[PDB]
Design a protein around this motif. Sequence first.
Motif, PDB file in Angstrom:
ATOM      1  N   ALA A   1      65.360 -66.502 -50.183  1.00 47.82           N
ATOM      2  CA  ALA A   1      65.134 -65.127 -50.600  1.00 47.82           C
ATOM      3  C   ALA A   1      64.297 -64.392 -49.565  1.00 47.82           C
ATOM      4  CB  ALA A   1      64.458 -65.096 -51.967  1.00 47.82           C
ATOM      5  N   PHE A   2      63.267 -65.059 -49.050  1.00 52.22           N
ATOM      6  CA  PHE A   2      62.466 -64.465 -47.983  1.00 52.22           C
ATOM      7  C   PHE A   2      63.322 -64.054 -46.801  1.00 52.22           C
ATOM      8  CE2 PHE A   2      58.917 -66.281 -50.173  1.00 52.22           C
ATOM      9  CZ  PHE A   2      57.884 -65.439 -49.854  1.00 52.22           C
ATOM     10  N   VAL A   5      65.651 -60.968 -47.682  1.00 46.65           N
ATOM     11  CA  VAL A   5      65.070 -59.637 -47.652  1.00 46.65           C
ATOM     12  C   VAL A   5      64.683 -59.264 -46.237  1.00 46.65           C
ATOM     13  CG1 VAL A   5      64.342 -59.774 -50.039  1.00 46.65           C
ATOM     14  CG2 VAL A   5      62.790 -60.498 -48.243  1.00 46.65           C
ATOM     15  N   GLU A   9      66.699 -55.598 -43.546  1.00 47.14           N
ATOM     16  CA  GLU A   9      66.242 -54.390 -42.877  1.00 47.14           C
ATOM     17  C   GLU A   9      67.050 -54.098 -41.623  1.00 47.14           C
ATOM     18  OE1 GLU A   9      64.360 -52.249 -44.085  1.00 47.14           O
ATOM     19  OE2 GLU A   9      63.882 -53.455 -45.849  1.00 47.14           O
ATOM     20  N   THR A  22      63.196 -47.441 -48.309  1.00 48.65           N
ATOM     21  CA  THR A  22      62.148 -46.578 -48.831  1.00 48.65           C
ATOM     22  C   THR A  22      60.758 -47.192 -48.763  1.00 48.65           C
ATOM     23  OG1 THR A  22      62.683 -47.358 -51.064  1.00 48.65           O
ATOM     24  CG2 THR A  22      63.684 -45.296 -50.339  1.00 48.65           C
ATOM     25  N   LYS A  23      60.530 -48.187 -47.903  1.00 52.07           N
ATOM     26  CA  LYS A  23      59.177 -48.694 -47.707  1.00 52.07           C
ATOM     27  C   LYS A  23      58.307 -47.667 -46.991  1.00 52.07           C
ATOM     28  CE  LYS A  23      58.634 -52.996 -46.550  1.00 52.07           C
ATOM     29  NZ  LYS A  23      58.097 -53.556 -47.818  1.00 52.07           N
TER      30      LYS A  23
ATOM     31  N   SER B   1      63.529 -51.282 -53.589  1.00 51.93           N
ATOM     32  CA  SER B   1      63.460 -52.283 -52.522  1.00 51.93           C
ATOM     33  C   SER B   1      62.051 -52.868 -52.401  1.00 51.93           C
ATOM     34  CB  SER B   1      63.912 -51.665 -51.203  1.00 51.93           C
ATOM     35  OG  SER B   1      64.115 -52.651 -50.210  1.00 51.93           O
ATOM     36  N   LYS B   2      61.702 -53.738 -53.362  1.00 42.63           N
ATOM     37  CA  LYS B   2      60.352 -54.289 -53.412  1.00 42.63           C
ATOM     38  C   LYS B   2      60.296 -55.768 -53.786  1.00 42.63           C
ATOM     39  CE  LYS B   2      58.322 -50.383 -52.467  1.00 42.63           C
ATOM     40  NZ  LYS B   2      59.581 -49.656 -52.142  1.00 42.63           N
ATOM     41  N   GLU B   3      61.423 -56.473 -53.822  1.00 41.23           N
ATOM     42  CA  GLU B   3      61.443 -57.827 -54.368  1.00 41.23           C
ATOM     43  C   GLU B   3      61.407 -58.916 -53.305  1.00 41.23           C
ATOM     44  OE1 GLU B   3      64.593 -55.185 -56.366  1.00 41.23           O
ATOM     45  OE2 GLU B   3      63.564 -55.420 -54.439  1.00 41.23           O
ATOM     46  N   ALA B   4      60.281 -59.060 -52.617  1.00 42.95           N
ATOM     47  CA  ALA B   4      60.019 -60.199 -51.739  1.00 42.95           C
ATOM     48  C   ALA B   4      58.818 -60.918 -52.335  1.00 42.95           C
ATOM     49  CB  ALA B   4      59.759 -59.763 -50.310  1.00 42.95           C
ATOM     50  N   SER B   5      59.074 -62.027 -53.021  1.00 45.31           N
ATOM     51  CA  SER B   5      58.070 -62.655 -53.872  1.00 45.31           C
ATOM     52  C   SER B   5      57.845 -64.097 -53.451  1.00 45.31           C
ATOM     53  CB  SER B   5      58.485 -62.592 -55.338  1.00 45.31           C
ATOM     54  OG  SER B   5      58.657 -61.250 -55.754  1.00 45.31           O
ATOM     55  N   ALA B   6      56.587 -64.456 -53.252  1.00 41.37           N
ATOM     56  CA  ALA B   6      56.207 -65.855 -53.261  1.00 41.37           C
ATOM     57  C   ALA B   6      56.292 -66.385 -54.683  1.00 41.37           C
ATOM     58  CB  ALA B   6      54.794 -66.029 -52.715  1.00 41.37           C
TER      59      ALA B   6
END
Lengths: 51, 55
Positions: A1-2, A5, A9, A22-23, B1-6
């Motif tokens: 997942a890391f 994401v 970009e 939108t960051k 666009s905010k879902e980068a989670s440990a």
Amino acid sequence: AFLTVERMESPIDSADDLAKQTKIEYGAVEDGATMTFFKKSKISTYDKMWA
Amino acid sequence: SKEASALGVQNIGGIFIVLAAGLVLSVFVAVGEFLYKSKKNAQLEKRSFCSAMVE
């Protein structure tokens, strides 16, 4: 997942790369005839970014 | 666009509890199997098997 994401970009950062991602946040001298060009616009990308 | 989670305790923590339950149930069934072999050898009361425990 890391890695997902991170690979999501794009660095070209064109008129549209700002639209999708939108960051980071926009900026404009409001009423300075550039923001007016956005608000007056009919360009889909400019339309949504004016919004 | 905010879902980068440990990953965190909030979302995975339960398997520590699973460890706890499995460990304890193993404890009980193990002492039960001790009594199983014990009664297989002799009558209900055991002292020499405490000696095997100590040795």
